[PDB]
Amino acid sequence: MYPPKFGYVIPDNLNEALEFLEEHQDARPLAGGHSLIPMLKLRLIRPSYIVEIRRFSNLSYITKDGNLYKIGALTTHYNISKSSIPLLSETASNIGDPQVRNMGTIGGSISHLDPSADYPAALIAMDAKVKITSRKGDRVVNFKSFAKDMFTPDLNPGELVTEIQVPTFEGYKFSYQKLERRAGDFAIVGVALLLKLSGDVIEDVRIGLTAVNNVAVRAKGAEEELLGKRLNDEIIEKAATRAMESANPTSGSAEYKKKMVKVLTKRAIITALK
Amino acid sequence: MYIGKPIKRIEDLRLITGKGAYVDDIELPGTLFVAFVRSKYPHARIKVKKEEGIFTGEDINPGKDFPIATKETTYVGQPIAIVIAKDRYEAYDLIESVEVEYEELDYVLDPEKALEDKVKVHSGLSSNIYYHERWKGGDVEKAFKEADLTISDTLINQRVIASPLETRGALAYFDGNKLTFYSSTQSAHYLRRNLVDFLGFENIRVIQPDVGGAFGSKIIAHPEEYALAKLALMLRKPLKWVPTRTEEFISAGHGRDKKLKFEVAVKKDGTILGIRGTLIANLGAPYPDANDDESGNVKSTVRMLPGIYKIIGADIDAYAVHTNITPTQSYRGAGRPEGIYFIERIVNIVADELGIDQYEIRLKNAIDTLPYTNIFGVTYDSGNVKKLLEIGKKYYDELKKEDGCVGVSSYIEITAFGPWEVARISVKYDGKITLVTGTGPHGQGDATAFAQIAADVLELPIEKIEVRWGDTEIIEDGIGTWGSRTVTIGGSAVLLASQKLKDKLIEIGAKILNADEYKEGNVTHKKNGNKVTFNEIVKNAFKMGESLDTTAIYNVKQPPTTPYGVHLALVKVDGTGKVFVKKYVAVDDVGTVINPLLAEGQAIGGIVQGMAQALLEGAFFDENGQLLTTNFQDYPIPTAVEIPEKIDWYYEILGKSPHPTGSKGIGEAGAIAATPTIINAVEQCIKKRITKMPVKFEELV
Amino acid sequence: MYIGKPIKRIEDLRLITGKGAYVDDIELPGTLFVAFVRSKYPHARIKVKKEEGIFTGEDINPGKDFPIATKETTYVGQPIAIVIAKDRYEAYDLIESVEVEYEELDYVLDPEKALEDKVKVHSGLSSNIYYHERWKGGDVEKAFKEADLTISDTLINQRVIASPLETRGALAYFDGNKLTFYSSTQSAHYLRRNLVDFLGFENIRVIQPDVGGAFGSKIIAHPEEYALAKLALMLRKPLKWVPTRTEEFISAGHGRDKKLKFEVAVKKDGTILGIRGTLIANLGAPYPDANDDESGNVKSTVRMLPGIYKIIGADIDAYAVHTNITPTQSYRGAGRPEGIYFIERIVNIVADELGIDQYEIRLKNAIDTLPYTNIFGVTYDSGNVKKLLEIGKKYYDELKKEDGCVGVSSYIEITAFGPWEVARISVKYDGKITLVTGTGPHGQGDATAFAQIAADVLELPIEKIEVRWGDTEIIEDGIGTWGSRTVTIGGSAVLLASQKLKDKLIEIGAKILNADEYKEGNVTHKKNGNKVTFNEIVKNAFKMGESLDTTAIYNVKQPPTTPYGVHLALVKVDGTGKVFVKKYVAVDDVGTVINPLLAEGQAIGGIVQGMAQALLEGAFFDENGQLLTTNFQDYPIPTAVEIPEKIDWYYEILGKSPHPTGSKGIGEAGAIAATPTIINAVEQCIKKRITKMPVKFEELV
Amino acid sequence: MKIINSDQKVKITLKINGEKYETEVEPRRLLVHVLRELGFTGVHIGCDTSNCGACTVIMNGKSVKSCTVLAVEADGAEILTVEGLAKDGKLHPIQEAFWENHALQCGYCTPGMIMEAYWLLREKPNPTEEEIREGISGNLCRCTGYQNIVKAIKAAAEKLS
Ligand SMILES: Cc1cc2nc3c(=O)[nH]c(=O)nc-3n(C[C@H](O)[C@H](O)[C@H](O)COP(=O)(O)OP(=O)(O)OC[C@H]3O[C@@H](n4cnc5c(N)ncnc54)[C@H](O)[C@@H]3O)c2cc1C
Ligand SMILES: Nc1ccn([C@@H]2O[C@H](COP(=O)(O)OP(=O)(O)OC[C@H]3Oc4nc5nc(N)nc(O)c5nc4C(S)=C3S)[C@@H](O)[C@H]2O)c(=O)n1
Ligand SMILES: Nc1ccn([C@@H]2O[C@H](COP(=O)(O)OP(=O)(O)OC[C@H]3Oc4nc5nc(N)nc(O)c5nc4C(S)=C3S)[C@@H](O)[C@H]2O)c(=O)n1
Ligand code: FES
Ligand code: FES
Ligand SMILES: [Mo]
Ligand SMILES: [Mo]
């Protein structure tokens, strides 16, 4: 309930934040605080300093820059949910509860890397990229490489996520399916789908799975089954089956969860198609 | 008249404007904060280094392991040490410095194992078995002789946790002569008796301030309350104790947790003849306050097994057994839900085995008229079960043609326990009236019902009747709020005191007018038409040395009054195994309804708890005796999304109680009916036998 | 028995350990601090700019200049604006920002000037004269016909200030429905009536917490209390008001301030035949609560002028007049000190003019037996004045041979005013007894006396009787503590309630034993010797629905009961004109003495106030109407150095009151007797006539 | 670059229901305790893991769980608590509707539930049953079973058009 004692830094600008973090290996930055503060309260972390990055308002923004959306790291769930990015907005909508989405940010969700988070299912499906900033400058990496393991982002002391990039997916159809015992919970299983039709052929298809592995994965087999094919009942059923091949879940039951991957992939294809 | 009207709550104004005062909203000068160190093991010998700001069980109950463990701890979550600091943040820092030496002992989690006495829950027990009696009634031999068939299985009613949104909490201050103790409790007067008994002196004032619910979890004095109180005698500063919610989950409000090994004897036409088997109830660790609470509840479970049916004999072997977990306590219904759940599941299991209709089997077996004494000696006092079921068939028929699966159950219930209850009413010289109840409402809205009762008796506007409770200094005494007794027993005390007041106002009025009629507080000479006003009577009572402050004690001579009803649900299960409840109908007979708005409000709150037990909740331990569900994420009480889309509540008054209010209790009825209603519904959709709860998603796919 | 024993105070333990709770020791969540802006002028029109955190009289009493002035202020110290801030320090910062526009009007300080109505104290008065009646009794014409001689002078009884060590103070909180108001007041129930009347609603709880003395200064509701209460309705935060001591001196506890123009008719043998003249009393500004308090006191002064003497006629022209100063209020004795001071000075002036001995003149003129009705209609009810004076001569004779000057005075006094008083006694199931009084002690120790009374009636140990008071929610009602009424009227209510309780315990005991003897709480069958204990009676009362909570109201049918006595002092004056009191003897008859330790404690406290009025204290104004003495340096209440080296207190019980306690009041007697005792003493040493007080050093050199 | 170590406090300002408060806090102190310590005791703590919503207040126009914000982090914010809905004792229509529809029992979730409702009705003037339920799914109540809360919110939505 009660955090441990820690120091606190309110830096004037980004440069200052970065330097303090460089020099203080075990200082943690604070964004929406909806994963950091709950962890302080249970005393599962004990940093020397919390560095406040929240007031850098030029880190909060949705920009359409050609055929990329550029999303400031400090952009909240709520604002992403309101901004018409195919798949991603609907996925943000599902996160936690209204109060949670009012504060939580995309930069903090992906820097935290809970293996049941919502965004990674959408972000892996989207081939999202992560702009990482340093006093040294910027590194852009693929979402897939950024997510090194549960709770293990590709971030060094001294650096912050400043931006998430995704293609614009115009004319794409999409669905985020979230299995949950109660409104507000993290995903028991999450399936994020993007596809685009050329006539009745599936021209592109992307399927992301969350809460069923240590990090988010592509449902490669479900993709193979659908890509380039003309849609009918049979292939949908088959793709939904093959999505189970990418699920390595943990005991609901591990077996129940694997079965739910098929159920939610089917719901995703059918919802996006309708 | 106000009685019978949906009068809106006099309680709401303070609370919707955030001007309540729950225990943690109270402060005294120099208040210190108290936290408890708790056992991380199910069963261990302990040594705790006493240090500055660090107290141990020896400071509280030397030579005993309860309320606070001194040599031997018997459950994860048991208090083993007490820290004191300047504030809550520093208190929890100080917790991390406490030095505990553990010797892990062997422990038992399963009450079925435990009853073999192979491993003792505590060193000094003769037996893990706290209670063991064979319950027999009617002619069980004849039942099983005459049966065409018998059916057997084991039904589980799993452990749950009360989880009121406000935790326990308390504030204790001893001035040198007198202890004042504020607590999030279900009764100030009962907590005072508990503290008087534990501390050995009478000069104790208890204050129940606003309480954020309890659902049975705050009847008993908890170990922390005894300890805080004893510490306050020693330290001479006010001491505030508020557990974290993790603490609350691990240490308090565990209830239910009963198993029935049953065999039922039936005729092929769905006649239920008799039952036998073994009831095993899990008391968890031996804490006397909790054991005593829960063991009375074990008896409620057995005695209600015959339900509303014309059973011919039964033979049930009842065990209440300790295990190395949080001691078990009353939770909403306090044994009655388990017993009704058992009979209503069995009834459906039979219906399903014999291809009989779930409604028809109940109309077949239902008691005809009341009064009736069940097989285990419970007298169902008034009403008409069959007739209420005929009324309810019309909703069953409607639901049967909608899309989804129907479940029904019928319940009968015991309420309005004694031994007595108190009410004081007083009138000041200027005319102000205050009514005080010895009950202790904590959300149920009885004070509005009390104000409706007293205003009808006095014939005054309801805004004239301020209603107070929860301070041992403003009323002679009280029992409390539990066993759905408050509007019935506490309201009957209110009716007596108001009547005494009216009788007194009459004779002073008569004296003033020379004679021996009352209307709206005024007294008039029934020809010559001379009149003395309410306010003139009151001022003259004072001048005449005549007091208008009166206290009535309503002693309860009758046995518990018994409501009954039939509830119905329509559900759907999807391809993920998630259950959706479309509709729920409750038909109840609770005697005179004092306030239909508040009564329905109780029905609905209970219904959603009963549904949540069927579908969501469960308190489970890993094999190290650690509770797996210790927060509102992992212990899933429902949000607004998980409720039935609509719950329609109806009442019929076919049977009144013998009490002056005519009312029976409803505080618990919803939670009793909803669980098997919902389970019967889901079972219709699946269709395998459901033997345990909550129903998991993976069990329905 | 406990009655009559010097039982030590049950009140002491909390207070010697610093665990009291006076009003400023109380806090609620978000409490704000309130200070008042006060008039810097005696008489002015005012405009105050209403601003953020700045309230004016228009917010409190629009269209009136009381309690808070809106258009016109009538005394330096009058509240003219109210500021609210986060805490006291910031409140007083904010005071300096308030913007007041004054139009100085003409004002009057001297009540003798004021009564000519040449300058009105307020614009809207018909007359500065609030009260004016000619008091006549016996046959004054015959007195002045038969006289050998007449003596004339003007005696002053100067203004003083109560100066309790705790100031007024209050804490007000309205939750949306109910106002809770804590105040350093003399009666919770009377303050509640005042607030109900001012605010127009009944839902007000008042709490008198510990009070640091009052001495009459806290009977009335003050303007600040009405305002705080009205503000609390508006602001919805708790609001704490505590004046600085400068404020207190300037605005509250002013008393006395009466002038007698007298002429006395005597025979040469020291027979005092009659008196006439003019009494002028200074009410200060028209504040209705204070005017009404003090004007009743004016009457007390006139009616007590005949003292203990066989006066044949008198004719006194009484004025109570407004002036532009702090309104005048009850101070210890409340008019009786002035009246006794007047007659006891006159008696010595005559003795000195006729060379009669100061003791002999009193034995000459003293009433013989009681009852006796004085010339102005006061019935002195019981006792024997002459006989008490014979007892006291033995100390006069002893003092006359010691070194220094002797003064004596004899007093009679009125106490134990009605109209009624309340007591509640209640017994909990476990047996605990609580006694509640409707009085409001604030230092006088009545609760110990109450516990002695109730324990004698019940035949129980005194530690069994907890005594509570000062919450409008724990007792039906009350009057209060003032007019030396508490042990007599409040104790008689205690005696009735305890008796009702005993009678009830008897019949329950009788019921349990089949019959119709009580000893020490137990009931026994007077052969066969079957016995039921106190605790068994109590548990059975609850089982039988019989309440052991009872309230008695003692209506006062008798007129005030009258103690009397003789006091004596020996003093010395040195070459600086400083007075030293060597010895003081008090001989009192106060009826049955409930507690000699506490009674003497009251005698001594009053004695030192009465001496301090003679020798030290005085409230004086400069000609701008500014009080010259506004702190404990310039208003010299005595330290331990300024007390008589020894005060011996004795009592005789020759006359009991008609009340069930037999007691009369002593709370005020010391202050009544000591002033003229001490002045008579000093006068013997000087020897010029003393006409005014305090006696200044320079007047004695 | 303002740096506050473990053992210091920092002065902060909070504007609460229209009024400014000023206090000194350690960095680790939660906004929920500070609000209560300043007298806003209608803000309630129902849990230790951010699930229950009993601590919900409006911070800068947003409903937030004040148990999951550090008080220092809230420096300079405008905060509305339930104590600030009623103007001069006239109930805000959400308060009125909770009373009319019996949407509270023990009252302990009620300040937070009313604040979430206030926020919700400013998002969506005329919400469906389903959107109401979603819209309060961060606010747990153990007493009412929610049905009356949904009724009160719809009645309030209509009062508010
Ligand atoms: C009751 C509740 C329910 C929730 N439900 C869900 C859910 O259903 N689905 C879901 O996905 N999430 C859920 N969450 C988590 C929520 O989405 C958090 O907001 C998110 O996980 C972390 O984002 P934040 O901005 O709050 O990060 P913070 O808590 O501020 O930070 C989290 C981590 O990232 C670091 N950090 C923050 N920003 C950066 C950055 N820009 N660069 C580098 N490091 C950074 C911090 O030091 C910290 O280690 C829930 C949380 C709560 C309290
Ligand atoms: N015939 C009837 C019966 C009841 N009522 C109304 O329904 C309520 C009173 O119910 P009653 O049946 O007398 O039950 P209690 O007041 O004694 O409540 C106790 C019961 O209350 C339940 N409901 C709870 N509700 C809240 N909000 N918080 C808890 O902790 C609660 N705990 C449970 C538990 S457990 C118990 S045992 C009152 O508003 C009463 O006026 C009525 O009008 N007419
Ligand atoms: N025959 C008697 C008379 C009195 N007593 C004891 O003497 C005291 C009660 O005196 P009582 O004469 O009944 O006077 P009250 O208690 O009603 O006190 C009121 C009186 O009390 C005085 N004394 C004061 N003492 C204190 N400490 N503080 C004040 O403000 C006081 N104010 C004054 C003023 S002014 C007044 S009017 C109690 O301990 C009583 O038990 C007794 O034992 N037997
Ligand atoms: S206290 Fe439970 S979410 Fe804040
Ligand atoms: S009203 Fe009790 S928790 Fe909602
Ligand atoms: Mo209960
Ligand atoms: Mo007095």
Residue numbers in the entry:
A (entry chain B): 1 to 251, 255 to 277
B (entry chain A), C (entry chain A): 1 to 516, 521 to 705
D (entry chain C): 1 to 161
Q: Anything the authors wrote about it?
A:
However, our biochemical data showed that in S. tokodaii, GAOR2 is more specific to GA, as compared with GAOR1, and indicated that GAOR2 is responsible for the GA oxidation in the npED glycolytic pathway in Sulfolobales. In summary, we isolated and characterized the three GAORs from S. tokodaii, and found that GAOR2 and GAOR3 share the same M/S-subunits but contain different L-subunits, and exhibit distinct substrate specificities. We determined the crystal structure of GAOR2, as the first structure of an archaeal Mo-containing hydroxylase, thereby providing insights into the subunit assembly and the substrate specificity of the three GAORs.
The asymmetric unit contains one hetero-trimer (LMS complex), one Mo-PCD (L-subunit), one FAD (M-subunit), two [2Fe-2S] clusters (designated as I and II) (S-subunit), and solvent molecules. GAOR2 has a butterfly-shaped, hetero-hexameric structure with a molecular size of approximately 140×65×90 Å, as observed for other XOR family enzymes. The Mo-PCD, [2Fe-2S] I, [2Fe-2S] II and FAD are located almost linearly, with distances of 13.4, 11.5 and 7.0 Å, respectively. In the GAOR2 structure, the Mo atom is penta-coordinated by two equatorial cis dithiolene sulfurs and three oxygen ligands: an apical oxo ligand (O1, 1.8 Å), a basal oxo ligand (O2, 1.9 Å), and a water molecule (OH, 2.4 Å). Although the present GAOR2 structure lacks a substrate, a polyethylene glycol molecule (pentaethylene glycol, C10H22O6) derived from the cyoprotectant solution is bound within a pocket formed by several residues in the L-subunit (Tyr190L, Ile219L, Asp292L, Asp293L, Gly296L, Asn297L, Ser330L, Arg336L, Phe417L and Gly483L). In the GAOR2 structure, Glu672L, a conserved catalytic Glu residue, is located at a position similar to those in other XOR family hydroxylases, such as DgAOR (Glu869) and bovine XOR (Glu1261), suggesting that the catalytic mechanism of GAOR2 is similar to those of other XOR family enzymes. The electron flow during the GAOR2 reaction is predicted as follows: electrons are depleted from the substrate aldehyde to Mo-PCD, and are then transferred via [2Fe-2S] I, [2Fe-2S] II and FAD to external electron acceptors, such as DCPIP and MV. These structural differences can explain why GAOR2 efficiently oxidizes hydrophilic glyceraldehyde, whereas DgAOR prefers aromatic aldehydes.
